[PDB]
Design a protein around this ligand. Structure first.
Ligand code: UTP
Ligand code: CL
Ligand code: MG
Length: 484
């Protein structure tokens, strides 16, 4: 791993062959599936012992065809407001207590009633496996089946999703935090494939209408109905190759307006959020930096956890990857040994790149006034020579981001023996023609956030400046808000 993978991807043909090979290398082996089935069987046996006539249903990564090595094993267990909440919560503990002291081999057990989808976390020691036991999310079964079906509908889906998943992991865009879940990322890829000029994938609405007899099903008041076999459905007339579709993903999602759009897998379309139209129907829908609607539960934004920082970093990383995707290094192979194609996408992010990709949250303000405020803070209060979404190129000959404490101390001392912007500029002027550090500053219309990226950095002091700006700029903007 991390060695074999690099040389395996370097060795093979074109980018598409690399994506396919990546699928081959990351997916679970037959032994891993054997192990998983065995553990599920154990779970099934003990829970049957406690709950006669109960079924343990595997779902998620394990059955949805997007499985990779080391992925979780998710299990659904199939057997007045606060009352029902707590009844539910009590049952969970029971399940927990069964996992804790009955089924042999599982040690880490933590009940999580406080989650949106209450679950009992567990780990099985001999198999090295770990996952979730969910009392009720029945939708998960169906959306898992939907993802597997999606892979079955077109052969480009799984390579695209695998490549983009590994890439997002490498860019710090996915995980269990404010980052996108793997499910949400997959949904985003599928959404992208739905919106192509010829569509690669159909909308879930279309699937729902195709459906079939006996294939009609509703769970929690939502319609989960779709055809069970891909055989009934006509192929895609979209002829685009894998490398193309990848580049198109990067470009497209880099150019989308995320805050103004609820991306709908049902309609295969972007529903304008402002104002209130998606918010009226489907009560319970959370809107924010990134809005991505579940194919079935329509009150569910699967991206609702994503902070503005993660969304901005997402579109930035996609813009960078789109620029790389236009390069000759991407498309064509290398003669001998060089990193080409998928490899720089799958390689870790540079510290300067990782830092510059994630934007800086700024106090709310009209776009025009905000831009003017920022250029004021750069022009004066900082020694920056600046010049002309919005963007500016800035040049510094000095250490201005550091040494400010001693300088202000000395100036206030001269004030002993002897309000923002210009005052702070004093602090700048007392800190002292090839620019020491030169960088770019960008502001996107919605939501307003500043992207600072390095241009000329001889001494590698850009990150210090970036942290400094992270602290200093919201402060400056803030005081410029209160001068009105
Ligand atoms: O918002 C969500 C998230 C997850 N899920 C359901 O839970 C499952 C878990 O989705 P995950 O985001 O955990 O990804 P995954 O399991 O497919 O891959 P690993 O994280 O195991 O590497 C998904 O397959 C989906 O069915 C939802 O229904 N809604
Ligand atoms: Cl597009
Ligand atoms: Mg998982």
């Amino acid at each position: 791993d991390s060695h074999q993978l690099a040389k395996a991807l370097a060795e093979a043909a074109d980018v598409g062959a690399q994506m396919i090979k990546l699928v081959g290398l990351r997916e679970l082996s037959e032994a891993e599936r054997q192990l998983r089935s065995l553990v599920v069987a154990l779970m099934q046996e003990v829970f049957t012992e406690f709950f006669p006539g109960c079924v343990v249903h595997p779902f998620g990564s394990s059955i949805n065809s997007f499985d990779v090595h080391g992925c979780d094993l998710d299990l659904f267990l199939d057997l007045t407001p606060k009352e029902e909440k707590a009844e539910g919560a009590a049952m969970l503990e029971l399940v927990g207590s069964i996992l804790r002291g009955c089924v042999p081999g599982v040690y880490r057990v933590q009940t999580v009633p406080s989650a949106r989808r209450p679950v009992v976390k567990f780990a099985h020691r001999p198999s090295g496996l770990h996952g979730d036991v969910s009392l009720s999310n029945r939708l998960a079964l169906h959306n898992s089946r939907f993802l597997s079906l999606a892979s079955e509908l077109d052969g480009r889906v799984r390579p695209l999703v695998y490549t983009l998943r590994a890439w997002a992991q490498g860019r710090g865009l996915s995980g269990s935090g404010p980052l996108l879940s793997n499910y949400a990322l997959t949904l985003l890829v599928i959404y992208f494939l739905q919106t192509r000029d010829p569509p690669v994938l159909p909308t879930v609405s279309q699937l729902t209408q195709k459906a079939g007899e006996g294939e009609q099903v509703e769970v929690d008041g939502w319609d989960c109905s779709f055809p069970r076999d891909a055989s009934r459905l006509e192929p895609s007339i979209n002829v685009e190759p894998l490398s193309s579709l990848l580049a198109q993903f990067f470009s497209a999602v880099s150019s989308w307006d995320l805050r103004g759009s609820l991306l709908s897998l049902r309609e295969g379309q972007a529903l304008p959020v402002a104002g209130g139209l998606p918010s009226n129907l489907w009560e319970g829908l959370r809107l924010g930096p990134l809005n991505l609607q579940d194919p079935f539960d329509l009150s569910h934004n699967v991206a609702a956890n994503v902070t503005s920082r993660v969304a901005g970093r997402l579109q930035n990383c996609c813009r960078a990857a789109a620029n790389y995707a236009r390069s000759l290094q991407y498309q064509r192979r290398s003669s001998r040994g060089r990193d080409w194609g998928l490899l720089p996408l799958l390689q870790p992010s540079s510290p300067s790149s990782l830092l510059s990709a994630t934007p800086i949250p700024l106090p709310l303000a009209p776009f025009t006034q905000l831009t003017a405020a920022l250029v004021q803070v750069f022009r004066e209060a900082l020694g920056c020579h600046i010049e002309q979404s919005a963007s500016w190129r800035c040049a510094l000959w000095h250490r201005v981001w550091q040494g400010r404490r001693r300088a202000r101390r000395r100036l206030q001392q001269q004030t002993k023996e002897g309000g923002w912007l210009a005052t702070e500029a004093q602090v700048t002027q007392e800190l002292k023609t090839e620019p020491l550090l030169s960088f770019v500053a960008s502001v996107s219309p919605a939501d307003r956030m500043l992207t600072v990226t390095p241009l000329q950095d001889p001494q590698g002091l850009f990150p210090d400046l970036h942290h400094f700006l992270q602290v200093f700029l919201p402060q400056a903007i803030r005081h410029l808000k209160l001068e009105h």
